Design a protein around this ligand. Structure first.
Ligand SMILES: CN1CCN(C(=O)c2cccc(NC(=O)Nc3ccc(N(C)c4ccnc(Nc5ccc(CS(C)(=O)=O)cc5)n4)cc3)c2)CC1
Ligand SMILES: [Cl-]
Ligand SMILES: [Cl-]
Ligand SMILES: [Cl-]
Ligand SMILES: [Cl-]
Length: 278
């Protein structure tokens, strides 16, 4: 019969990752597996290792397609794939360690939302990340505060996949009832999440969230007077229920809320603060 290649440039087989990487801690433990912190035995370089016991060869294949997609995302605000291993029934995904951790974990630690200037840098950097992915025909499909990882320098790295610190709060109304516009809606939801710690409809019975997205007007900030006219306008247009009229990432990058954002300082200070509290 016609057959598929199992040779991929970014997946190495029959090599024990544990000969190359030392596990020095745990960063997360999701439904798909643990994420470890790892240190390279030869160089001391740091990585996140996401480790999955893949059941089916179909599953393995789906994941590897995603790894190979990530391998082509060379952008300064997207996590950097080192590479992957498949060993002993375990798929290891190695990413360049972002030591600041995830924005929502930072919010929960400090028990507060981001200032608007912090939200401005994250929004700006996310849109650049998105504009890049969409132009390579990549839909992210997984945007939320839990996917925004932080470096010490104060830049984001957008994670292809992440876990909140799974009710689908960020789902686009078109998907509720595959196109780049759905990522824009989820960005909008993510910004409210960063403004208010929790995304809209956090209080509801999770069984009602999708219903509520479908029937409701788009969500708005809870205390509008706390936020600039720019920010409220950005949300208004990003959170358009009609994907046709919803603006692209390219169009959003020219919105006054982010068009002038050139410095990461606001965010750099947030990571510094969260570093002292731990
Ligand atoms: C829909 N399905 C579900 C099943 N599915 C997959 O499973 C899947 C399939 C193929 C590819 C991938 N890609 C990845 O797995 N990428 C990846 C992305 C990010 C990281 N992490 C977590 C990284 C990366 C870098 N740095 C950190 N720093 C860090 C430091 C400290 C703290 C702690 S704190 C301070 O408390 O927040 C946390 C983090 N974490 C690891 C791996 C996933 C595919 C789609
Ligand atoms: Cl590697
Ligand atoms: Cl409802
Ligand atoms: Cl405006
Ligand atoms: Cl688009």
């Amino acid at each position: 019969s016609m057959r598929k290649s199992r040779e991929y440039e970014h997946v190495r087989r029959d090599l024990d990752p544990n000969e190359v990487w030392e596990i020095v801690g745990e960063l997360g433990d999701g439904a798909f597996g643990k994420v470890y912190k790892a240190k390279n035995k030869e160089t001391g370089a740091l990585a996140a290792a996401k480790v999955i016991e893949t059941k089916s060869e179909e599953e393995l294949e789906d994941y590897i397609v995603e790894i190979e997609i990530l391998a082509t995302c060379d952008h300064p605000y997207i996590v950097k794939l080192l590479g992957a291993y498949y060993h002993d029934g375990k798929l290891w995904i190695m990413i360049e360690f972002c030591p600041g951790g995830a924005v929502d974990a930072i919010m929960l630690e400090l028990d507060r939302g981001l200032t608007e200037p912090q939200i401005q840098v994250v929004c700006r950097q996310m849109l650049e990340a998105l504009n890049f992915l969409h132009s390579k025909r990549i839909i992210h499909r997984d945007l939320k505060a839990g996917n925004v990882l932080m470096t010490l320098e104060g830049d984001i790295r957008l994670a292809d996949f992440g876990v909140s610190a799974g009710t689908p709060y960020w789902m686009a109304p078109e998907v509720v009832m595959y196109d780049y516009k759905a990522d824009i809606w989820s960005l909008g939801i993510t910004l409210i999440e960063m403004a208010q710690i929790e995304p809209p409809h956090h209080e509801l019975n999770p069984m009602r969230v999708l219903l509520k997205i479908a029937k409701s007007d788009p969500p708005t900030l809870l205390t509008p007077s706390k936020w600039s006219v720019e920010f409220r306008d950005f949300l208004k247009i990003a959170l358009d229920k009609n994907p046709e009229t919803r603006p692209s990432a390219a169009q959003l990058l020219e919105h006054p809320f982010v068009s002038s954002i050139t410095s990461n300082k606001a965010l750099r200070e947030l990571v510094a603060e969260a570093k002292a509290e731990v």
